[PDB]
Design a protein around this ligand. Sequence first.
Ligand code: A1LZM
Ligand code: A1LZM
Ligand SMILES: C/C=C1/c2cc3[nH]c4c(c3C)C(=O)[C@H](C(=O)OC)c4c3nc(cc4[nH]c(cc(n2)[C@@H]1C)c(C(C)=O)c4C)[C@@H](C)[C@@H]3CCC(=O)OC/C=C(/C)CCC[C@H](C)CC/C=C(\C)CCCC(C)C
Ligand code: HEC
Ligand code: HEC
Ligand code: HEC
Ligand SMILES: [Fe+3]
Lengths: 62, 346, 63, 63, 268, 275, 318
Amino acid sequence: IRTGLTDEECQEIHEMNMLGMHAYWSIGLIANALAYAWRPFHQGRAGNRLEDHAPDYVRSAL
Amino acid sequence: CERPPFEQEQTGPRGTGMYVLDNPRILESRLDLHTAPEARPMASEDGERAGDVHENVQVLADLSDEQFWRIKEEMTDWVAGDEGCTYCHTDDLASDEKYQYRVSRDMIEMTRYLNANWADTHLTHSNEAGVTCYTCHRGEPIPPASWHSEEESGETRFMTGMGDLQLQNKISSKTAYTAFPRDALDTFLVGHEGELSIVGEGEGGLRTATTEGVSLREAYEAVGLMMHLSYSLDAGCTLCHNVSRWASWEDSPKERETAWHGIRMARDINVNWINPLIDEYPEDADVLGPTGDVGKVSCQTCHNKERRPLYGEEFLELYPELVGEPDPDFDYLQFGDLGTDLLKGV
Amino acid sequence: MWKLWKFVDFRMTAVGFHLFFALLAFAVHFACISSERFNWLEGAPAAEYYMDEDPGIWKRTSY
Amino acid sequence: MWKLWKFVDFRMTAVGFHLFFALLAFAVHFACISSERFNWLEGAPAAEYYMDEDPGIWKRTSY
Amino acid sequence: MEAFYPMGIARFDWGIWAVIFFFVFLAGLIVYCRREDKREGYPLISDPNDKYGAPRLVSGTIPRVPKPKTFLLRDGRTIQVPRQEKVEWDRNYKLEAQPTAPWPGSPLEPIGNPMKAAIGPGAYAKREDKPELTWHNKQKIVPMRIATEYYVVEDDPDLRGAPVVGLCGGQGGRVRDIWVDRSECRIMYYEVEISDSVLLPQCFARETRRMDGVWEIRVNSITAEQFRDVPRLSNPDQITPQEEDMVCAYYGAGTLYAVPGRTEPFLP
Amino acid sequence: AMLDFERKYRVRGGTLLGGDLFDFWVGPFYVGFFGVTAIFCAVFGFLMIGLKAAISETWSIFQLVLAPPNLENGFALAPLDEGGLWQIVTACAIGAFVSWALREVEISRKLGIGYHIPFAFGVAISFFVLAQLGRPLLLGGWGHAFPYGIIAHLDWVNNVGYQNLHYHYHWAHMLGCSLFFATSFALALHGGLILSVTNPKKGEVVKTAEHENTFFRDFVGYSIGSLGIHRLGLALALSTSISCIFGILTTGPFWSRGWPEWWYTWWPQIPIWNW
Amino acid sequence: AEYQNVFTRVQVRGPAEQGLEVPGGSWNRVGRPRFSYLLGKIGDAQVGPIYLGATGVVASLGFLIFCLMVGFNWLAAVDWSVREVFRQFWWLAVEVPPPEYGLRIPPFNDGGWFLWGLAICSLSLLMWWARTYIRARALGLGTHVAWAFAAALWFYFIITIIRPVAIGSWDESLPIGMFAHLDWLVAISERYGNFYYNPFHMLSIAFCFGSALLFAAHGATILATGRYNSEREIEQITDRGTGSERAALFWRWTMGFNATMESIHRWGYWMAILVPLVASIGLFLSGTVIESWYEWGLKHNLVPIYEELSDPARNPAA
Ligand code: A1LZM
Ligand code: A1LZM
Ligand SMILES: C/C=C1/c2cc3[nH]c4c(c3C)C(=O)[C@H](C(=O)OC)c4c3nc(cc4[nH]c(cc(n2)[C@@H]1C)c(C(C)=O)c4C)[C@@H](C)[C@@H]3CCC(=O)OC/C=C(/C)CCC[C@H](C)CC/C=C(\C)CCCC(C)C
Ligand code: HEC
Ligand code: HEC
Ligand code: HEC
Ligand SMILES: [Fe+3]
């Protein structure tokens, strides 16, 4: 149903919405890039399980 | 749906709710399962020893020939099922080619041990019953109530995946169809580190600075084992407890005490007699459980939904050849309670 | 489908589609998590790491 | 889509996105904790610490 | 009587101390609820039927009667509970009854016809004499002849014109119209014309389908003749809370006084 | 000692049994013959409870119990020291509950209100009667009925529940616990709604039935209404008492195994998913 | 007999009432109001419209996410067989972390999924509570319903989070399963003595049994006095009528004391919301202060002592 908002009210709402959405989006992209550089989220074909690469004495929760 | 009347046994003070209702029609329907076969006539001890008239006789060597044949025929009637003598025997009767032969040798040793050592504390509570081959097997090669480790304790765990019930939350007769931990039989009737005294004590009923109890998970496991106990004896918790005070032995019916020994006895049976059989079994035997384990003995293995196995039929005097000599260093407290001296290998 | 909003409420359509796609994104991520091959949090190896050839999908390979 | 606020209540949309992102931040952080590789609270080693080659993500590595 | 650090000493533990604290809170909560109970009918009044005077200090004060609660209303009125018009109504209520015995706690036997006495089950409270409105200032309790937007659902009998029978089965009247509550969307009253029109509370009316397939209203409370004595409406098309309360009280009077037997026990 | 409006209703008549002899008030209480008999049964039963406290040397409301006879006693009259006091107090409690409900019938007649309150109380009384008679009849003796102790009847509930291993899984227990939880849930909702309508923030006017209807329509999509909430509440509480009847009459009499095993007996084998 | 006010034999329908004006109501009220005749037998027939608020929508979404997490875990537990899920519907659960983690969030399949779902469910319940509060406030109502839900949610957080944290172990928390959370009941009561001996358990059962008592008695009272329009209780509170008078006099002549039309709802509100509150107190003390309720009540002369058994069981472990 119609919200009753004028074009200018919708445009200021959308200005704020674009600001919030894209600022959160860019901050999250930077955060995910930092966490990915810390530890890449997606394993290679070899995987990244400690049991497959670490020595036997390195305990793995897996 | 069940129906009155019931055989009632008031196990505690009046009005406490401490009684057990047993369905007479259900016991009548399980009468074939719960009655041992008619015993063979007693065999004379006078005669040539079975180890002298037979090449490969070691466990029954000290038996007379007639006692040997009596016990062989009874074991055939108790474990062989419809396979008969060929169940454990090849064409050569002195050859242990079949694992059933050597397993039955160890089983004769175990039955002798049970009748010699567990009769005073557990196997002769109401009657001089003891156990025979039929007590667990009930005429079949595999005891119907033999249990294996659940096919979740042996599987590889997907630790970061989905759908791990943690040995709980599944239908199992091992927990009397509760969602309680299904590996309680391993924890208590095989393992000895498990704590069954889960009810808090504290000091004044309070978590004092010195008070250390069990975790809630340990309570889950113990209550699951207790569900198994109740399932096996076809009775409720009131058979051995004023549930209002589980830790109170003085308020518990005598059947708790013998049940205690049964727990340890099961551990004994599983640790010193059942598990070491895995060497005798073939590596890919279909009899072995999903985890590649031999079927262990639980409460239900002898208590096939019955308060006393085989209606408490007496076998100690009836089968002296299944009663061995008492273990000189037998101690029911050395099965994980005062120590682990009598649990060989652990 | 531009006339659908003459008869179908775009409010409920959009809200329910966003709610359902949140639920479905969670569902699909759960399906990936439950899969050993696809759980990135577990980080299990791909079987292709050990195959000497391309398995394909429709490749009609033979043992 | 500045015209979406002619038909979708922006107050609901913004507040609901904030609520769902609180819920999703908890969900995702808990997912990371539930992963050994990504549990910074437990601080397990990375398999890259013990690998002599870069595993890659799309790199067609073979055993 | 050992100390139980950090959980107390002897029985002075925090199981019992949280128990004591919660019983203290529960006692305070019961006291609060009792004070809220004392917002109507309090302060208590002794029985006037008494050979002795009234004690200066009256009962019902152990949880104090709270300060009267202020309710702001939609119509802009600020009412104070207990509402003093109701209290003065009770003070000046015409009894048409005498105590059976000269002691307090004696029941009141009505002097004459108890249907018209408005005593006991026929007693009614003082209520507003202005018809109640909904949030949109619409007549809350309205006949369906005025609120044409309200209709009896298809699956249910529309008893406009249906016979209304009394306790003894006599024809009390016919349903001229149905009064509905706009806010509650329920039938409040059946307007029953008598061959004049009275109102019949919905809970005093049993819509019974006769084996003829004809629906009727069975009124167990009063008889067909007594339908002529139901309190009429000051305005035919509207009912005030006072008139609702009067009509309901008349039928409640009938529940005990419609016939001589229903006020008497099985075995006296 | 009498409400501001009470005298206006304090009329003679409405008695089921008692005539005008017992038709009076003592303070706030209406008496009636059923009030006389209710006081008789209540005080005599409490005096028998005190007699058990004396003979058992248990002067503690918590530790004192009148337990029914032993199971071997059957339906026989027991010695007062062996369950006879429990039998006397069972008769006293049945009589007191019935007399209380009948006094409430008298009060309802005198006030011209429906008999819904004594009916609901009679549903609770029916639970008590079927628990203390129906369970003995099903199981063959007074010893299967629960005892009369503040804490000890909790021990009986414990032991009778654990007789079927895991009593939570009882179907009647599951339904009745759901019904008690729904009853407390609905009482919380209903008290909260009425107080919210009549006690908004300070300075706000008292709201209406439209307000509460639209509150639950906005909240959960459905508003049951003023009449509907009380009908549902009477139904929920009554139905939980009937569920209690079924639970106490089925655990043991109609299932002597574990309720977990009861659930396993049918639910996993339902052929639509047993394959 | 007289009309018992049990069912509405004749239902009347007006125009479908969208609801009283609230901020955002025109947009957020969704669903064409549907009239259930079966629901109209008891109460209002109208179903809908529902408020599609931010808190309500996201709380429902989080509840759905939680339910789907539970369902996916059940599927993966039964090898993704919906048939086996339904076969074992009551047994299956998302199990809590084992004690060896303590308060650590474990891997998903070692109780981490339980903590994940606990976070999702707790946040969704808090958003639903916020919806309760805001829906009450938007209509100019008191937040009593929100605070009753707050009492229930406080008990829920004690069960799931606060008390497991105070004990220091997540295995004390409530498993997400039909039979599993009943097994949690058994395990908690028997591990910590016996909740039958827990006086807050006693009081919470007193308040639950008394919620049933008060709400049976109050529904019966209102249905009995519906002859005098007592079901319209708001009017009976602001404009006390003969129905409220008769209800009060019934209960005064029965018990010696009565309530008002408003104070009976105060009584019922508090009797209900006391169940989760004193429940939370007793559960929290179980495992933090109290190790055995049986031993504690033995010290307090609360636990009955029964006839000494002939031939008691003697602990073989001394
Ligand atoms: C181990 C074991 C166990 C158990 C046991 C069991 C058994 C045997 C049984 C039961 C029951 C149940 N429960 Mg239980 N439990 C558990 C638990 C639980 C839970 C959780 C949480 O967990 C929950 C929630 C639950 C609840 C329930 C519910 C439902 C129910 C109850 C209620 C009743 O009944 O009351 C009912 C009751 C009634 C009605 C009552 C009535 C009065 C009368 C007239 C009135 C008058 C009186 C008087 C005295 C006067 C006063 C004066 C003034 C004061 C002046 N659960 C565990 C498990 N379980 C029942 C049944 O079934 O139902 C269904 C039975 O039987
Ligand atoms: C270890 C750890 C970790 C993490 C962590 C965290 C925390 C703690 C948190 C987070 C988040 C968040 N994220 Mg992340 N991560 C992770 C991963 C990820 C992923 C994947 C792929 O994997 C994704 C896609 C994400 C995403 C996101 C968002 C959606 C949110 C928001 C932010 C933003 O905005 O950004 C922004 C955005 C973004 C980043 C995104 C975008 C598109 C892109 C370009 C593309 C896509 C692709 C795909 C999907 C496929 C590939 C894969 C394969 C297999 C190769 N994350 C890891 C695993 N987190 C948050 C939340 O939730 O909020 C509420 C939080 O709190
Ligand atoms: C589904 C509906 C329900 C419902 C409905 C409802 N209950 C009502 C009314 C309505 C409509 C009333 O109208 C009536 C009333 O006046 O108060 C509001 C009443 C009442 N119920 C009471 C207690 C109550 N009720 C409970 C359950 C429900 N009550 C279910 C949930 C529960 C429990 C355990 O759940 C309790 C303890 C009293 C307060 C009051 C009766 C007084 C009496 O009997 O007088 C008689 C007066 C006395 C003093 C009785 C004494 C009689 C013997 C000799 C004393 C010994 C007592 C026993 C042997 C009982 C067993 C003891 C246990 C420890 C094992
Ligand atoms: C498994 C449970 C067996 C069944 C069934 C039967 N027999 Fe057996 N038999 C079994 C064992 C383990 C042994 C060795 C006994 C010992 O003390 O070591 C035997 C022994 C015999 C022998 C003597 C072997 C020899 O040295 O010749 C014979 C002759 C024999 N058994 C015969 C026999 C018959 C005829 C059976 C069927 C009725 C039968 N056995 C059943 C194990 C098992
Ligand atoms: C209970 C304590 C037992 C008694 C007494 C006896 N047996 Fe047994 N036996 C028992 C178990 C639990 C098992 C394992 C079953 C399983 O699931 O694998 C066995 C096994 C055997 C076997 C081998 C069964 C097979 O794989 O075919 C044999 C041949 C056997 N037992 C023989 C046997 C005999 C001869 C006994 C009496 C002297 C005897 N058993 C006693 C449990 C118990
Ligand atoms: C076979 C080797 C058994 C196992 C394993 C368990 N029990 Fe047993 N139990 C067994 C016998 C032969 C007997 C004697 C029966 C008799 O009539 O004397 C018992 C006895 C009990 C009893 C006492 C029963 C009674 O007479 O009242 C109880 C309570 C009991 N057993 C419990 C019990 C439990 C709890 C067990 C598992 C932990 C258990 N038993 C194992 C044989 C065997
Ligand atoms: Fe109400």
